[PDB]
Amino acid sequence: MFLPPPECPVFEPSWEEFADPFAFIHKIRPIAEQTGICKVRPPPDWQPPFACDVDKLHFTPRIQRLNELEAQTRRDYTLRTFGEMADAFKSDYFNMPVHMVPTELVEKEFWRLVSTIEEDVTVEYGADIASKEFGSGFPVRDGIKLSPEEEEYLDSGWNLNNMPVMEQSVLAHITADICGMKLPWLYVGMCFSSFCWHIEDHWSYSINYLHWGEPKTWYGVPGYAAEQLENVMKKLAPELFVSQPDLLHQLVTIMNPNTLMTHEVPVYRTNQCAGEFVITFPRAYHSGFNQGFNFAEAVNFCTVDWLPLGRQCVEHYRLLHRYCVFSHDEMICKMASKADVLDVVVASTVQKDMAIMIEDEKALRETVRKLGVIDSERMDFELLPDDERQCVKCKTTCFMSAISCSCKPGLLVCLHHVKELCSCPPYKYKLRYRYTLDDLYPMMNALKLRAES
Numbered sequence: 001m002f003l004p005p006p007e008c009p010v011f012e013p014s015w016e017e018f019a020d021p022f023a024f025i026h027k028i029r030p031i032a033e034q035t036g037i038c039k040v041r042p043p044p045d046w047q048p049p050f051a052c053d054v055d056k057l058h059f060t061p062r063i064q065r066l067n068e069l070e071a072q073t074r075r076d077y078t079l080r081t082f083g084e085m086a087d088a089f090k091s092d093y094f095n096m097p098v099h100m101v102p103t104e105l106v107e108k109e110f111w112r113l114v115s116t117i118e119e120d121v122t123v124e125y126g127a128d129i130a131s132k133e134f135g136s137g138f139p140v141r142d143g144i145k146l147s148p149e150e151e152e153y154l155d156s157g158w159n160l161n162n163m164p165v166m167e168q169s170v171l172a173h174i175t176a177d178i179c180g181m182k183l184p185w186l187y188v189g190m191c192f193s194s195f196c197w198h199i200e201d202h203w204s205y206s207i208n209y210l211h212w213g214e215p216k217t218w219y220g221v222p223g224y225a226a227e228q229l230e231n232v233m234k235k236l237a238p239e240l241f242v243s244q245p246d247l248l249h250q251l252v253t254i255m256n257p258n259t260l261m262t263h264e265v266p267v268y269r270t271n272q273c274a275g276e277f278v279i280t281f282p283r284a285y286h287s288g289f290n291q292g293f294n295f296a297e298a299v300n301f302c303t304v305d306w307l308p309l310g311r312q313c314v315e316h317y318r319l320l321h322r323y324c325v326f327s328h329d330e331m332i333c334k335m336a337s338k339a340d341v342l343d344v345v346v347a348s349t350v351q352k353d354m355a356i357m358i359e360d361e362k363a364l365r366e367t368v369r370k371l372g373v374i375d376s377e378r379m380d381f382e383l384l385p386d387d388e389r390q391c392v393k394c395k396t397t398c399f400m401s402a403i404s405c406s407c408k409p410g411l412l413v414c415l416h417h418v419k420e421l422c423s424c425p426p427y428k429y430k431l432r433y434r435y436t437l438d439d440l441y442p443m444m445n446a447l448k449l450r451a452e453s
């Protein structure tokens with residue numbers, strides 16, 4: 001038996017509210033952040049044109065076994081051949097035409113299927129970044145002629161290609177090609193294809209648009225309940241918490257939301273239909289499955305609301321010895337170096353994060369000086385490939401400073417792990433720093449000037 005979680009909030013913005021996605025997301029945040037996910041129905045005439053050739057769009061399928069609590073990690077189809085497989089799979093599974101299968105029954109059956117080890121149901125799906133073989137479902141600039149209709153949606157805030165690069169995703173001004181975090185993912189679903197419980201890298205927001213097809217079913221948990229959920233999952237599937245050694249080696253799983261609810265974890269659900277958005281909030285766990293053949297597009301983003309959580313996240317990563325996707329401090333300093341061009345509310349928020357950064361950095365440098373690290377030299381950390389500037393102990397990506405030693409050339413530790421670098425006395429160590437404290441205060445003041453005008 002399956003008891004569906006309560007429905008998440010559904011928002012229907014007027015065109016005035018809808019015009020600015022960041023203003024709207026800030027408006028709904030008090031409500032939506034208590035549920036982790038929410039659904040947004042755009043104004044009825046906001047209809048970006050879904051147009052593609054099913055025979056030239058093609059992708060390499062991923063394959064999925066559907067067993068609850070079993071670990072998962074993070075051939076060629078055209079859209080047409082995948083759709084034909086997907087449709088025959090579902091109609092044969094239920095011996096029904098695909099749109100007479102009620103969504104409630106698919107949900108019930110999904111949770112039955114994944115709990116029964118007697119059934120070896122495997123499905124396939126597409127998940128990849130936009131590429132030349134498979135691009136965004138939103139119109140993008142390309143010197144193809146677009147209809148005026150498509151041109152109307154080229155610059156939309158809700159065109160997910162624009163959202164990262166706008167004024168207000170602080171992830172915009174990052175120079176480091178992240179790929180995973182400024183670029184949309186494309187999701188080609190079939191019945192029962194599912195995404196395991198996860199949060200986004202660096203606790204970012206995410207926004208997901210279902211271009212067309214049968215619904216996508218979601219489960220979401222608010223950010224405040226994140227550790228609650230992890231403790232429940234640790235108890236019931238400890239295999240998923242044995243630290244796997246890479247950023248590509250991370251273990252995730254399917255788990256019945258009723259199990260979370262039994263352990264007093266708040267869980268919300270929704271069916272996302274074609275033309276609707278789902279937004280996930282920072283540190284909001286989510287999972288779900290596709291009801292049938294469909295096509296979705298999603299992107300991470302970071303608002304000013306998120307900045308302190310991004311700092312908290314990197315602290316949390318350092319403690320799990322988890323790899324970072326980027327350096328949060330490097331992003332902050334990059335924005336400070338562009339203070340004159342920043343949005344003024346962005347500038348004010350970055351300035352507050354930078355004040356914490358500088359005070360933390362001052363204390364860390366005083367601690368390591370008391371350990372006998374005397375020598376120091378400036379170092380342009382941002383020039384180093386990420387794998388050359390990770391702390392040996394905690395894998396954090398260094399930027400503000402690190403400790404090196406002549407005894408272990410090329411190795412670095414962050415300033416929390418001075419004692420973990422090598423066995424040589426401390427006077428052989430060297431503090432490598434991006435900025436002196438005297439460099440840092442004028443950068444923060446530029447932000448204040450930009451903000452106060």
Ligand SMILES: C=CC(=O)N1CCC(n2cc(C3=Nc4c(C#N)cnn4C(=O)C3C(C)C)cn2)CC1
Nearest residue numbers: 074125126127187188189193194195208216290296
């Ligand atoms: C990060 C590195 C990496 O390699 N990967 C990410 C994790 C993997 N992955 C993603 C999915 C999906 N995620 C989602 C969401 C969300 N959030 C919303 N809808 N949705 C899907 O329908 C599917 C899919 C079933 C089509 C499935 N596997 C593999 C790729």
Ligand SMILES: [Mn+2]
Nearest residue numbers: 066113114116
């Ligand atoms: Mn099973």
Ligand SMILES: [Mn+2]
Nearest residue numbers: 198199200206
């Ligand atoms: Mn996600």
Ligand SMILES: [Zn+2]
Nearest residue numbers: 391394414417
């Ligand atoms: Zn460290």
